[PDB]
């Protein structure tokens, strides 16, 4: 049948065009925690109340976070169901994971929803899933919890993608940029849904490096959908990936470590994470750009993963950014905190969002290319060039 | 401007022209060789279960069933003797476990690999891809970044991190590594599955019989594979091509094999008829794959099946009538390597290419010029990849 022209099935198979993102969704727990009042709230709810010195240590760290609020599954009701989860080093995987393998799924259907009504199409066109997550891991997968809570069909291809951290965001993009361009009529639901739950633990004056996720991370999912060769005046993209990258950057070895162990998740930062991304990301930009004629970095419409605000910090100072570059990745910092793998895509979200209500000639802030890093353990750093589309 | 004055013919420049192939097969187990007959012994003595003597015989019969007869297991007696929690039914040994597996896993899986890498004897600068699955452990970075390091390869290699999926994911790596690749000009992708039972190994337990099957079946391996696009004459040598994936989770399936990773480890709980649901549902599968291609008869398909147990392949072989030397290759890596998860169908795959060189058949599938591999596990979830053999 298609065995007498293979050549001619292999080009029907594939699709046209560009992967291009046609909607974006993004959800998070309900229960927002203000900055400002959070070391008072943690060091009450992990009875360390009294530990004067530590808590003035960790509100140091909160006043300088760059972070108004985060969102949060862990309520102070659940904490209080949860007594192993609030000291520092206790059993408390099991705990942990019964959180985790219900809410990642649930949050990141929440998040899928609203992109799904925004492109507008029935979920029986989605074909392909790629789910992420950081937090929890379970068989069957958090892909295959989604695809039932949203009644995909039961032949969805999925992905799963777990314990990948804060770079996935940009690696989910890579993924659904193959899936969707090489197979015709492909859309491609994606999901990255994140739980501090996982990591979540009392503070000690031992170890301190452990305050900093209790001071960065937070909740939320965020869901796209992604395809090639959109239906005219049906669907409408917000942005095309051009060229995709994944980088481990040089003598970058132990940088960001995750352990999944018997007290849940711990991370460990054994170099300058800020120095190792700014001194290495221009080599990524002239990688990626060089053979789009492009040099000047402030020409482009910019989405950083914002892992702590010195990475931004120093990766404008680095490269003479113009403070508006990053002023999109700053604002979801400060309204959702690091939410890993999902933080780039409420990003991309609050960009075109911005770009609509400022008049802009493009989703990207009147700019035709921009670019989307993530950044994470290896050190890894993802690089996503994207295009814009006319307003 | 450069390549923004035509991005139409960019993205036709960057996609590759042909279809995903198969240009090398390299596969590794732990020196640690475990005889299936004298096994119940074994694991009895070694999980100080010994006075079991009921449940002992209960292990013997889903021994002697298992149609096993050799399985590889990093853990060993000394190994075992240094970690009794793991010999336990269920201790707290996930950190044990863990600290096994997240350094094992990547170096069986850089076994494999370099074997690969051998043959198909390009430079390993020239992997721009690379896929890592296992459902054993795992920790940040991955072991892609593992296999990575130890390889030497490229610190822009595009990887692929797949943990925790489970049985059907030597068909997921494959229906990957196929978008990868075709997607890609130049694209070579070095696609690894390696699997570690020191995860889910325990003791036995009268009470949970059908947990102690899982220690009668489960055994090490380590596959790799090159795949890429437009191989180059006379240099590279495919020996399958990839024609075409599907994935579906079955009807009435649910919570048929759910794992869950614990501080105990990773342990499964079990529901329905597998053999049954599988050999029910599989044919619908077959012709969702092959009506395009005007194939009925599958018999005159080429056969990989992922081999979860013997029940699993005598249902499949009953309900379709398939010739009883269909399923050969695979039950010859069932019998010397046991049920390796992710990594079994490449095993196989490398058993139907060498055992038709070796018989004189004019193809790498047993001179047939189609043919089917199927992944199964969790979900329940069926892989279906159609091949194409590769003329000899």
Same mark, same amino acid.
């Given at each position: 049948?298609?065995?007498?022209?293979?050549?001619?099935?292999?080009?029907?198979?594939?699709?046209?065009?560009?992967?291009?993102?046609?909607?974006?969704?993004?959800?998070?727990?309900?229960?927002?925690?203000?900055?400002?009042?959070?070391?008072?709230?943690?060091?009450?709810?992990?009875?360390?109340?009294?530990?004067?010195?530590?808590?003035?240590?960790?509100?140091?760290?909160?006043?300088?976070?760059?972070?108004?609020?985060?969102?949060?599954?862990?309520?102070?009701?659940?904490?209080?169901?949860?007594?192993?989860?609030?000291?520092?080093?206790?059993?408390?995987?099991?705990?942990?994971?019964?959180?985790?393998?219900?809410?990642?799924?649930?949050?990141?259907?929440?998040?899928?929803?609203?992109?799904?009504?925004?492109?507008?199409?029935?979920?029986?066109?989605?074909?392909?899933?790629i789910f992420c997550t950081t937090?929890?891991?379970?068989?069957?997968?958090?892909?295959?919890?989604?695809?039932?809570?949203?009644?995909?069909?039961?032949?969805?291809?999925?992905?799963?993608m777990y314990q990948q951290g804060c770079f996935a965001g940009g690696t989910v993009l890579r993924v659904?940029?193959?899936?969707?361009?090489?197979?015709?009529?492909?859309?491609?639901?994606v999901?990255c849904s994140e739980? &501090? $739950?996982? %990591?979540?633990?009392?503070? *000690? /004056?031992?170890?301190? +490096?452990?305050?900093?996720?209790?001071?960065?991370?937070?909740?939320?999912?965020?869901?796209?959908?992604?395809?090639?060769?959109?239906?005219?005046?049906?669907?409408?993209?917000?942005?095309?990936?051009?060229? &995709? $990258?994944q %980088?481990?950057?040089?003598? *970058? /070895?132990?940088?960001? +470590?995750?352990?999944?162990?018997?007290?849940?998740?711990?991370?460990?930062?054994?170099?300058?994470?800020?120095?190792?991304?700014?001194?290495?990301?221009?080599?990524?930009?002239?990688?990626?750009?060089?053979?789009?004629?492009?040099?000047?970095?402030?020409?482009?419409?910019?989405?950083?993963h914002?892992?702590?605000?010195?990475?931004?910090?120093?990766?404008?100072?680095?490269?003479?950014?113009?403070?508006?570059?990053?002023?999109?990745?700053?604002?979801?910092?400060?309204?959702?905190?690091?939410?890993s793998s999902a933080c780039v895509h409420?990003?991309?979200?609050?960009?075109?969002?911005?770009?609509?209500?400022?008049?802009?000639?493009?989703?990207?802030?009147?700019?035709?290319?921009?670019?989307?890093?993530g950044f994470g353990p290896?050190?890894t750093?993802e690089?996503?060039?994207?295009?814009?589309?006319?307003?």
């Amino acid at each position: 049948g298609m065995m007498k022209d293979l050549e001619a099935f292999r080009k029907a198979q594939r699709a046209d065009g560009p992967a291009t993102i046609l909607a974006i969704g993004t959800a998070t727990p309900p229960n927002a925690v203000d900055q400002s009042s959070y070391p008072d709230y943690y060091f009450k709810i992990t009875n360390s109340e009294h530990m004067t010195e530590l808590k003035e240590k960790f509100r140091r760290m909160c006043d300088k976070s760059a972070i108004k609020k985060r969102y949060m599954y862990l309520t102070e009701e659940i904490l209080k169901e949860n007594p192993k989860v609030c000291e520092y080093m206790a059993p408390s995987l099991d705990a942990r994971q019964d959180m985790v393998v219900v809410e990642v799924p649930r949050l990141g259907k929440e998040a899928a929803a609203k992109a799904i009504k925004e492109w507008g199409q029935p979920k029986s066109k989605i074909t392909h899933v790629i789910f992420c997550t950081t937090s929890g891991v379970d068989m069957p997968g958090a892909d295959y919890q989604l695809t039932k809570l949203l009644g995909l069909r039961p032949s969805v291809k999925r992905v799963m993608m777990y314990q990948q951290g804060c770079f996935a965001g940009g690696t989910v993009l890579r993924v659904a940029k193959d899936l969707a361009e090489n197979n015709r009529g492909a859309r491609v639901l994606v999901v990255c849904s994140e739980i &501090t $739950a996982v %990591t979540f633990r009392g503070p *000690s /004056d031992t170890h301190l +490096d452990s305050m900093v996720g209790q001071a960065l991370f937070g909740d939320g999912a965020a869901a796209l959908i992604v395809g090639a060769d959109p239906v005219p005046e049906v669907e409408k993209p917000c942005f095309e990936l051009m060229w &995709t $990258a994944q %980088t481990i950057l040089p003598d *970058s /070895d132990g940088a960001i +470590d995750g352990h999944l162990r018997e007290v849940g998740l711990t991370f460990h930062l054994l170099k300058d994470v800020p120095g190792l991304i700014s001194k290495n990301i221009e080599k990524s930009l002239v990688e990626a750009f060089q053979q789009f004629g492009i040099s000047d970095w402030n020409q482009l419409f910019w989405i950083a993963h914002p892992g702590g605000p010195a990475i931004l910090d120093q990766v404008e100072a680095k490269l003479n950014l113009d403070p508006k570059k990053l002023s999109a990745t700053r604002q979801v910092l400060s309204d959702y905190g690091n939410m890993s793998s999902a933080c780039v895509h409420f990003i991309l979200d609050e960009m075109r969002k911005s770009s609509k209500e400022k008049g802009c000639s493009t989703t990207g802030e009147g700019l035709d290319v921009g670019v989307l890093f993530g950044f994470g353990p290896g050190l890894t750093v993802e690089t996503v060039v994207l295009k814009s589309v006319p307003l």
